[PDB]
Design an enzyme around this catalytic site. Structure first.
Site, PDB file in Angstrom:
ATOM      1  N   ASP A  32       0.888  -0.981   0.074  1.00  0.00           N
ATOM      2  CA  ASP A  32       0.049  -0.004  -0.035  1.00  0.00           C
ATOM      3  C   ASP A  32       0.819   1.277  -0.045  1.00  0.00           C
ATOM      4  O   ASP A  32       1.437   1.578   1.064  1.00  0.00           O
ATOM      5  CB  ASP A  32      -0.989   0.153   1.119  1.00  0.00           C
ATOM      6  CG  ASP A  32      -2.055   1.084   1.057  1.00  0.00           C
ATOM      7  OD1 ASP A  32      -2.235   1.692   0.022  1.00  0.00           O
ATOM      8  OD2 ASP A  32      -2.347   1.333   2.177  1.00  0.00           O
ATOM      9  N   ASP A 220      -1.949   5.435  -5.630  1.00  0.00           N
ATOM     10  CA  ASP A 220      -2.061   4.647  -4.701  1.00  0.00           C
ATOM     11  C   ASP A 220      -2.189   3.076  -5.108  1.00  0.00           C
ATOM     12  O   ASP A 220      -3.164   2.842  -5.579  1.00  0.00           O
ATOM     13  CB  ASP A 220      -3.551   4.888  -3.981  1.00  0.00           C
ATOM     14  CG  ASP A 220      -3.594   4.351  -2.416  1.00  0.00           C
ATOM     15  OD1 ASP A 220      -2.618   3.411  -2.346  1.00  0.00           O
ATOM     16  OD2 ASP A 220      -4.820   4.380  -2.040  1.00  0.00           O
TER      17      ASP A 220
END
Lengths: 339, 5
Positions: A32, A220
């Site tokens: 992440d 992201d």
């Protein structure tokens, strides 16, 4: 000194096998760029209602000789509403055979996420606050910083290759770049936030129209789809034929017909002439039930997720505050250099 | 999914 790590395409997320503890307990955890803390699912955790949170590995602190229980409560909240709670600790973390000692992590005993998350963003974005926003624990060295600090990589930087939409696996490289996996030259873009890995998106070209943007977009790896402010998303939805549907008191989602034509591309124009082209296959997302989401959704936060990122090769440099980008070249060929 | 705060 580069560390290659395999990314498992799980569908909505990309995860990697890492190990934690003296006894190398295997955890499969989400990679992440949008969060900064590494947490693991405790073997005795209580998963959220309907959440199978123990099927991707669990961590038992009591069987690791090196596990340190810090005093301190851990709490984090994510963009999609999911959360995790537990306690802060420290242990050895091993990534493709490379170990770092005394890495601060969280031991999570309640979570509504399916598996642990390895947050690799800026340390300034660590989840070190209570619910009200009061800081309860200091900012600390997260995984990429520790890799650098213990001499495993030269620079706090990593390259992201999610690979093609059909691929079972991709690669993340800490402290290196695979120069075989992009066409043209990597173009360096200035990171525009001190907390988030955001760069300026100048404009988006869709269906023969150019839509001026001029604001920051979060790159992201831990978001599935692409998110834009409501008015900008509506402009694009008008060309694409996506329709807004209210799904909760406060939530709206663009749906699109599953059989919608997916020819054509969407082009994203960034600083310094950098350009990423995304095939329109990326904007039809199959739900379980015979309906489909559009691959763009409305939000206050602008996020280019996996449906964008699969089409770029990205070198995130958290020391230089740049993200360097180029159109991805899908290939098994590999020529990695250190950064 | 959408990964912090």
């Amino acid at each position: 000194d580069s560390i290659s790590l395999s990314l498992i395409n799980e569908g909505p997320s990309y995860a990697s096998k890492v190990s934690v503890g003296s006894n190398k307990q295997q955890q499969t955890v989400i990679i992440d760029t949008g969060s900064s803390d590494f947490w693991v699912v405790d073997s005795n955790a209580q998963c959220g209602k309907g959440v199978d949170c123990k099927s991707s590995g669990t961590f038992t602190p009591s069987s690791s000789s090196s596990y340190k229980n810090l005093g301190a409560a851990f709490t984090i909240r994510y963009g999609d509403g999911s959360t995790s709670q537990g306690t802060w600790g420290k242990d050895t973390v091993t990534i493709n055979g490379v170990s770092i000692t005394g890495q601060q992590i969280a031991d999570v005993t309640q979570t509504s996420v399916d598996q642990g998350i390895l947050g690799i963003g800026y340390t300034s974005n660590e989840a070190v606050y209570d619910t009200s926003g009061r800081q309860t624990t200091p900012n600390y060295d997260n995984v990429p910083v520790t890799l650098k600090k213990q001499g495993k990589i030269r620079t706090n930087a990593y390259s992201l290759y999610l690979n093609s939409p059909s691929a079972e696996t991709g690669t993340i490289i800490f402290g290196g770049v695979d120069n075989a996996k992009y066409s043209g030259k990597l173009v360096a873009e200035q990171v525009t936030s001190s907390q988030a890995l955001t760069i300026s998106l100048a404009s988006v070209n869709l269906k023969g129209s150019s839509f001026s943007f001029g604001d920051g977009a979060l790159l992201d790896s831990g978001t599935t789809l692409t998110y834009f402010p409501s008015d900008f998303a509506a402009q694009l939805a008008d060309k694409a034929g996506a329709r807004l549907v209210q799904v909760a008191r406060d939530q709206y989602l663009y749906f699109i017909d599953c059989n919608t034509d997916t020819s054509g591309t969407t082009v994203f124009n960034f600083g310094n002439g950098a350009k990423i082209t995304v095939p329109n296959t990326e904007y039809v997302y199959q739900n379980g039930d015979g309906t489909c989401l559009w691959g763009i959704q409305p939000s206050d936060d602008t996020i280019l997720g996996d449906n964008f990122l699969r089409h770029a090769y990205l070198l995130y440099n958290l020391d230089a505050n740049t993200i360097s980008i180029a159109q991805v070249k899908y290939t098994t060929d590999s020529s990695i250099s250190a950064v | 999914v959408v990964f912090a705060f």
